[model samples]
Target: RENRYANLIPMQEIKSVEQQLYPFDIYNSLRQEAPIRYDESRNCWDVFDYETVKYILKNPSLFSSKRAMEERQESILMMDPPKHTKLRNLVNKAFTPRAIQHLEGHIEEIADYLLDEVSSKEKFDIVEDFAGPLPIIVIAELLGVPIQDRALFKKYSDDLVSGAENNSDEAFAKMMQKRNEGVIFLQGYFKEIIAERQQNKQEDLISLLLEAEIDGEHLTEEEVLGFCILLLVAGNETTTNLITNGVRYMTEDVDVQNEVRRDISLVPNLVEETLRYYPPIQAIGRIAAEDVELGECKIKRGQQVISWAASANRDSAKFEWPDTFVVHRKTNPHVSFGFGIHFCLGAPLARMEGKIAFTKLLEKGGFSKVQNQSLKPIDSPFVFGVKKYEIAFN
Candidate 1:
C-alpha cells in the first residue's frame, strides 16, 4: 500500500482534480512508469496500460461497473450483466448503425447550415456559436424535440455538466444547483414527451425506445426518462467536445488544415487521430466486484478503478510515434471509443458529426486562427474540452 503511487502523481494537497491536465510528456512518463497506479486520494487504481485497459473493460464480471455512486439503477452505463445485457439488447435494436447512417445526409445539411450562419463573422466562440450547439441540434431532432424548444434543450444539456471551475465552495454549490435544475428540467420535459408519444408516436429515438421490447417486456416510464436523461447528459457533452476539439486541431494547426483541404478523405483519418490524441473522456470509473491481480497490483473487492484511455491511446507500444498526430496514420487501433460492453453507443454519431464539421470547415478556404483570444480549457480531471476557443476564420 505504501507503493500504491510510488512513482506516480500523488494527490499532493497542491493540485485540484479539475486542475489536473494530462499533458503529453508528463502523462506519457507516468504511463510508462507504471501500468496501473493506486491513487489513494481518489481511492481508485488508475490503469493506463494499453492492453490492461482493454482487459479491465472486457471482463466486466470481475471489474464491475457498479460504482455504487449512481442512483439511477436503470441506466445501462452502471449495470452489471443479465440486467446490462437485457437492457443493452433493447437499446441496440433502436440505436442501430443503420439508424446512425440514416442521419448522415441530414447531419451534413445541418453542418452546412451552421456554417452559413457563422461564415460572415470575423471571430466566433467555437464553444458557443458552432461546436457547442451542433450536437444538441442533431440529438434534439433525433429525439423529436420541437424546433422552438431546441435553445432551451441546448441549455439543459450544457447546464448538466457545468461544474468545478477553479474551485470555491460557492462556485461548486452554484454549479451543483444549475446541474440539478438541468436534470429536473429534463426529467419533467421528457415525461411530457413520453405522455404525448403514448397518445401518438413519432419517428424519433424516444418513440423507438418507448416502443422497444425485449423478452416480451417494454421499458417502464421511469426507465424511458432515465435513458433520455442519459442521452442528453452522456451523449450530448462528449460529442460537443469531440467536434470542438477536432475543429480546434484543424484551425490551430495550419499544416494539417492544408492536408485536409488537399484531400477531404483525410477528414475521417483526422477525426480518428484526434480521437486518439485527445479523447473526450480522460478516464472511466469502475469498481472491482472481486479480488483480482492487475499488472503487479492486487486489487481487492469494492476498490475503485479508473481506466485512462487517453493515456493508452498514446502508448508507444501500440503505435509508431504515438505522441504525434498523424492525420492519416495507418494501423491505428485507438481505444478512444472505449472497450467491451460499455463502449460508447454514440461512437458512430460523433464520428459522423466530426467528419462533417471538419470537412465543411476545410472546404470554406479560410485561414482559421486563435491569434488573440483567451483560450480556456474546462477544469476537470474526468472530461477533456475547452471552455471557450475564440477562433477567427478569415
Candidate 2:
C-alpha cells in the first residue's frame, strides 16, 4: 500500500522505516533548493530549516494555529492568542513544574510497577510492557479516570492517530469513521467525568480544569471535555515514543548506555537528546492568516504550512553536529514539544516520565536490542515512533 500522506513529506521513496526515520538528507537538499515550497497536490507549504520553522511557530498572528478556517473552535492547541493565551494561562496553573513535581514519586512508582513485570523476562516488547502503558496510565490517573480504562484509552488514541494505509477514498472514509467513533467515545467518557467533577471535586486535572477561571471566564463544559480529550490523545503516545525512542537509542549504542549507567545523572540529557534525535511528533501544521513571504516564497491567505521539527533539529546551522546524537548536548534547543504558545502543555510531565523510565531501566540491567527483528514505524507520517520495540536485558 502507498503512503496515504506521502505528499506532505519530501521523500520520493520511503520504502522502509530507515528511510522514513532519516529523511534529513532529503530535508538538507530541500533547505537549499526549496526550504519553503508550495505543494500543489497537497495544497500546503512545507517549511524546513531551524529559523524558518521557528518563525512560523512563534508568530501565531501571521501563521494561525488553526489548521483550517473551518476549524473555528478547538482545544488550546488549535487556538491562537488571545484565546490560546487565556486557556494556556488557566491550564498552566494546574500543570506548573511545582504541581507536576509532586507526581514524581507517583510516576516513579508507576514506572517501577510496569517494569517489575518485564524485568525478569528473557526478552520483552518494550511498547507492550513498558513504553506504551506508562503515559496512558499517568494521564488516566491525572485526569481522575479509572486505571482499568487504560486499555480503552489506548484503543481510542491509536485509532485517532492512525492514518489511511492507501489513498483510496474508501480507505480514507473508513479511517475517518474509526476516528470519529473514537472521538465520540472519548467525549462521552470525559463528559461523565466532567459532570461528576462538577458535583464533587478531586485532586485530579479534571477538577482543576473545572474550577479554573481566567479574567472571570470559566472553561465551558464542552471546553473541559475537549481539553481532557486533547490531553489524553496528545500526551499519551508522544511520551510513550519518548521513552521508547530513548531506550532504542540506548540499546543501539552500548557506549552511551554504559556512560549513562555509570553516571545516572545523564538520564535527563539522554531524554532531551532522544527528543531532538527522534522526535515524537514530527510535523506541526498552521494556516497563514494573511499573505506572507517566507524563504522568498509567497504564502497566500489561508494556505496551510507545515513546520518539520524533525528537519529543523538537524539543521547544521543551528547545531554543531546536526546528525550526531550528543548525549550531554549542552544548549540543546529542540522543537519536539513545538515552539511558542503552542508548546506541549505536558512537557514537564513527559520529561519526568522519560527520566524516571530511563533511570529505572539503567538500574535494572544492561539492555540489548532483540536480534534480527524488523522495526516498524508508526502509521502516521507526522509521528516518529516504532509500532513496537523489542529488547532484552542481560
Candidate 3:
C-alpha cells in the first residue's frame, strides 16, 4: 500500500487526466519553485530544472528509464546501458543521416498532397484533416505497409494512448485488445515485407535487420516485431502532435503566420520554436537503480522518477521569456526530442515532416479566421496535444 520508502519521494496527489495533460502553468511553477522537487502523489521525482533534467538524462547509470516501465519495458528508450546500446545500434542502421535526407523530398511531397486535398474546403479540423493523416501515411510507407490500412492502425494507436484514463474494466480490456490487434497487424505486415527482403536482399532498414547478426547471432523474430511496433507508434504518434501543436501556435500568432506565409524559409525556425514551445511527448519516466540523491531529495531503488521535458523547456533559467512563443529563439535547448544516448532516433524525420507540413500549409491554404478560439486540448497524462483545432482557410 505504501509505495514510499527511505529516500523514496512520492507524489500523494493523483492529478486528473486534464490537469496533467496541459500542466504548462504547473510546469512553470515547478521550474521556479522546486526544480528538483519530488511529488508524493505521483510517486515520481519531478526533475524540473533544465540542467538537472539534462544531468539525469546523461547519467543513465544513476537514473534508469528501464526501471520506470519495469513491468512492461521494451526497446532503447526504456532500456539502460549495454542493452540500450545494442538495440539502438541495430535500429539506427535504418534511420541514418543519409536515409533521413532522402526522406525530406518525400515528406515535402506528402505535405503538399495532403494540403491540396483540403485547401478548397471552407473549414476543417486541421488535426484530423491534415496533421493526423500525413505522418501516418509517411510512416506506413516507410514501414512498407499499405497506406490504405493506416486508418485502422491510427484508430488502434489512438485507443492505445488515449485510453489510459478509461475507468471501466471493459474499456481497459478493449484498449488492450485493440493494441494486441495492432501488434498482430504490424507483425503480419512486416513478416511479409521481411520475407520479400530476405529473398531479394534489398537495402531497406527492414531488409538490413533481417540480415543483421548481432553479437554473432541473428535477431529473433520477436525482437524484430518489438522494434517494428516501436517504429510504427513512435514514428506516427509524435509527429502528429508536432504538426497539430505547430499549427495551433502559428494560428495564435498572426504576425508569425504572415511572416511564414511571405517567406517560407522561416518554417524550419518555426518548427524548432514550436517544438520548444509545445512538445508532443511531455514527460519521460525513469527509475532509480540504487539509492540516489538528486538535488535535495533522495530517490530509493525501484522508485519511478519522471523527467518533465515540458517543464524543463519552460524553465526561466534556460529560456528567456519562457512562456511566449518566439519563432527564432537563438539559444533554445528544448528537449522536445529528448537528450543523451536515448535521444529520439526519429528526430530528423519528425523535424522534416513538421517543417514541410507548416510550410505547405502557409504557402497553399493559409488559415483565415480562428473560427473557434476556445479549443479543448487532448486529455492524456503521457501525451500533450490539442484534441480539435478548427480553423477556416481563406
Candidate 4:
C-alpha cells in the first residue's frame, strides 16, 4: 500500500513531473552529479546532500536566511547576523534549560489531562484529541493567551501555515491572502496585549518580552507582534508533528512500543530517533548573498537556496543505515533541530513536551486499531505531518 501523501507538491511544482514525488522519493535522484543543482522551473537551488546542506547553513555570511521576497514576515528566523542575534537574545532567557525545566511538571499535567479526555473512548483521533491540543494549550498558558479564545487561535494557526499546491500566480495569491490576513489578525490581537503588558507585566512570555530591554533599546509594538506570530507557529506545529510521527512509528512496530513501555530510558532515544527519521520541518529557505560555488553548482547572487533538511537526515555519508529506524543509534547527530545561528529557539520546550507526551502514552497503554483504518497525511510541501491518525488503546 502506497501513501497517497507522498505524491504531494507545493505551489511551484503543482502541475509537473516534480509534483508527483516527495522528498524521500527524489532525494537519491540528487545524490549523484553535483549534489546541488538549479531547478530552473522553481528558480531555486535545490540542495539534497548532507555535507552541502551543512556547509551552506554554517556559512551564514555567504548564504543569508533572508528571503528573496521583500514582503514577508520579519521574524527572527528570516533575519541575518547582528539583527537576528539581538532579537534572539531578548527572549532567549525563557527557552533556557532552567526556564523550561520549571514547565516540566506543568507539561506532564497537560499531557495527562489531554489523555484523560480520550482514555475512556478507546478509539480516538490522536491528532485531534491528544497531539494537536497539547502544545497549543501549554503555549497558550505560556503566552498568557485567554483560555476562552483557544478555538480562534487554533483556526488561525491552521490557516497561517497551510500551503498551496498549484504553482500558478493565482494559487500563490490565494495562499498569500490567507497568510496576510492571519498576520493582521495576530497584530491586532497582540497589540492589545502589548499595551496591557506594558502597564502591568506578568510572568507570561508576552509580559517577559515587554520587560526585556536590549542594550538600552526596547522592542516596538510591531516587533512584539511579529514575535507572537512566530512563536505561535513554531511552538505548536513542529511539536505536534514530532509527537504524531513518534507515535506512528511506535505503533507500526509493537515491539518498539512495548520495549519503550518497559524501559523508560529509551524514551529520549525514541524522541531523538523520531527527530532524525521523520523531521517535522522538511525544508528551509536561504538566499545567496554573493556568487559562490556549492558542491560543483555555481549559485549566483540572490538565488533562492532551499535546503532539504529531511533529505540530509537520510544521507548515507552521515548516519549508518540512514534508511532504517534504530531506537538508540550511537551517533544521532541529525540536523532536525537545524544548525548554525538560526537553530530552533523552542527546542528545549519541544523536547520536554515530546518526552512527557510519549512517557504517559507508553506508561498508560498501547494503541488498538479501530474500524476503517486509514492514514490521512497533511497535504503540504514544507509541513510534514498527518492530518488524521486514528488509533485505540489495548
Candidate 5:
C-alpha cells in the first residue's frame, strides 16, 4: 500500500505499524526547519507551528477556504465571509448548541445501548461496534433519516473521505468516481426528503432547514442538499475517529485510563487532549487570495497551503508539554475542531458523544488491546484513524 503522506513529507518507508501511527517526528522536524514550506509533490505550501497555522485559519481574507480547483458543490466549509456568514447563520438556527444539549440524555442512552450489544463478547472491535455507529445514529436521528439507513450513510461517508490506495491513475479515477456517486446519491436522497418536508413538516433538521430563512429568502434545494450531504459526511467519520482515538490513548497509557476511570471530571480534559494528541483531521487546505509573507517564506497569490493542525497542536511554544497527554492540563486551545469562522459546527455534539461514550466504556472496568492484532492506520494522509481497534474487556 502506498503511503500518500510520504509524497508530501519526507519519512521512512512506513513498513512498521508504529511509524504509521507516529508520524510526529517528521512534523516536528519540519516545523523546526520552517513555519511554511512548499512541497513539490503536493504542489502546496505546508504550514507548521501553532502561531502560523492559527494565523492562516483566523484570517479568511488572506487565505480563502474556497478551493479554486475543486469541482464539488460548495459547503459552508468551502466558502468565505459574506456568503459563508449568511449560510452558517441560517444553519446555526437548526444546529444550535441547545439542540445538542437536549440530546445529551438521548446520546447517553444510545451509547449505553451500543455497549450492551457488544457485552456478549469478551473482546470487541471498538470501531465496528461502538465508535463508528454512535455518531452515525446520532446524526441520522438528528436529521430524521431512518435509523435502518445507517449502513448506507456509513458507506456514503466513507466514499466521500476515501483516498486512493495506490499511485495508479485508474485507482484515483475510481476513487473520484465513487466520491462523485456518493455526492449525487446524497443530493437526490436529500432532494426527495426536502420535497416531502415541503408538503408536510416534522421536527427534524430537514424541516428546520426548509423553514430556515434569511431576509425573506430561504435556502434553495441545491443549498439544502449541500448542507445535508456536508452534515452527514462531516459529522460521521470525524467523530468516529475522535471516539476511537480517545480509546487508543486510554489503552496505550493505562495510567491515563485508570485516572479517567477514577475521576469523571477529567473526561472533558481527556477528550481535549486526545483531540490535540491525535487530531482526526490533521490538515486543512486553503488557497491564498493574495501574496502574503508567512514567517520567512513569501507565498504568491493563488497558491495552495495546507495547515497541519496535528503539528500545531503539539507545538512546544504554544503548550508547555506539547507531546505529553496531560489529562488535567489547564488552558488547552487545540485546533482539532479548527479555529475562527470556519470552526467545526458539530463540535458540541462530538464532544458530548465522546464524554458519554468514555463514561460508559470506563464503567465497563479494565480493558486492553487484543494482543498481536494487525494495527493499520486509515488509508488517508489527511485523516488520523485506525482500520479497526479490538480490545478485550478485563
Candidate 6:
C-alpha cells in the first residue's frame, strides 16, 4: 500500500502504544523536526512550530480555510475573504463579549446543578456524569431545545463525530441515517422556533439572529439554520472535552490539583494550560488556493495543508517547558482555540464553562480517581478528544 504522502516523514515509527497513552509526544516530535514538514502520507504540509502557525493564520488570504472544504463553500468556517468577513460579522452579534458575560450566571447554575447530582454520589464517571451533561444542557438551553431532548443531541453529536470508531460500518451508516433524521428534526424545530420568534421576538441568540440585519438585509432561513447547527455542535462537542481533560489532568497531577484547590484563582491558568496541553480539536486541514511557499516547502495549488494546532501548542520554540502543565506559565500563547478569523466562536463560552466546572469541582469534595483508567480517544484527525473517560469524584 502506498503512503498518503510521498515526502512525508515517518510518524508511525514515533507513534506507539505508549505514546498513544499520551497525546503530546506526537506533537513534541513534530515540533522538534522542522516547523513545517511535508507529510507524504496525508499529501499535505504539516505546520508544527508556533511562530510559523501564527504567521500562516495572520495571512488568511494566502492560506485559506475555505479551500480546505471547497465543496462546502457556504459553511461559515469554509468561507474566504470578503464573504468570510461579512458572514463572520453577521454571526458575531450572538457571540459578543457582553452576550457571553450575560450567560455567566446561567452557566454557573448549570455547572453547579450537574455537580450537585454527583456531589451526593461519592463516585461517578466524571466524563459521563458531569463533563458531558453540562455542555449538552447548556447548549440545549441556549438553542431552546427541550432539556429532555439532550440525550438525543448527545447521541447524534457523538455518532456524527465518532462515526466508524464507535460504531460498526452498518451501525455507522445507521447512526448517520439517524443523524440526518436528527438534522431534519432540528430543521423543523428551528423553523417553528423562528416562526414563533418572528411573531413575538425574545431576548435570545436565535431571536437575535432572526431579527439581525446585515447591511439592511436579514439572514435567510438557511443561514439561520446553518448558524444554529454550527453553534449547537460547536457548543455540544468541545467544552465536554475541556472539562473531561481538565479533570483527567488533575487526577494525574496531584500537586497541580493541590495548588488549584489552594488558590481558586489558578483555575483560569489551569484551563488555559489544559487547553494547550490537550486541545479538543487537534489538527485542521486547509487547501492551497494558489501556489504558496510555506518555509522551505512549495505547496502546489490545491494541495491540502494540515495545520496541527496541538503540535503548535507543544512546539518547544513557543514555551519553556511545553510538555509540563504549568498552571501559571505567564507568557503562554496557545493556538488551542485556533488563530485568526476562523478562530473558534465559542471560545468564551468554553472558557467560562471550564472555569465554572473546575472551580466547582475543586470547591466541592475533591475528585477521586476511578480504577481501570483507560482512555478511549476519538480517532478522527479533525477533532482530537476522548471518546470515553471513566473516572470517579468524591
Best model per lDDT? 5
- In candidate 3, which residue ranges exceed 4 Å CA deviation? 1-22, 68-72, 166-203, 373-376
Per-residue alpha-carbon lDDT of candidate 4 for residues 80-197, written as tens digits (9 for 90 to 100): 8798899998878878779889888888888888888987785888788888888888777778866456557766776677665555566566666776777677667878878888
Question: What are the clashing pairs of model 2?
Answer: none
For model 2, state the Cα shift of residue 14 in Å. Answer: 3.5
- What C-alpha lDDT values do all the predictions have? 0.75, 0.81, 0.73, 0.76, 0.82, 0.72
Count backbone overlaps in model 5. 0
- What are the per-model numbers of colliding residue pairs? 0, 0, 10, 2, 0, 6
lDDT of model 6 at position 263 = 95
**Global local distance difference test of model 3:** 0.73
lDDT tens digits, residues 249-355, model 1? 77767788898889888888988888888787777777789999985799999887888788889888888988777887877788888889988888888888888
Per-residue CA lDDT of candidate 3, range 322-352, in tens?
Answer: 8888776676789988899989998888888
Instruction: Sort by lDDT, best first.
Output: 5, 2, 4, 1, 3, 6
> What is candidate 1's CA lDDT for residue 156?
76
Instruction: Give the per-residue lDDT of model 6 (tens digit) for 1-394.
Output: 1212111222442344355447567677666767687764445777877887877777777777764222455457777778678778876766666777888888888878887786667577777777888898887777765657666667666644443222224634554466577667666777787888878987677787788787789988877776777777788788888988888888888788889999999999999998998887776666677888776689887776777788888877677898889998886789988888888888887888899999988988566577676676654445656766665554
The predictions' CA RMSDs to the true structure, in order, are 4.0, 2.8, 3.8, 4.5, 3.0, 4.0
Q: How close is candidate 1 to the true structure, as a TM-score?
A: 0.89
Candidate 1 Cα misplacement greater than 4 A, ranges: 1-22, 147-151, 162-178
Q: TM-score of the candidate numbered 3?
A: 0.87
Lowest summed lDDT window (length 10), candidate 3: 4-13
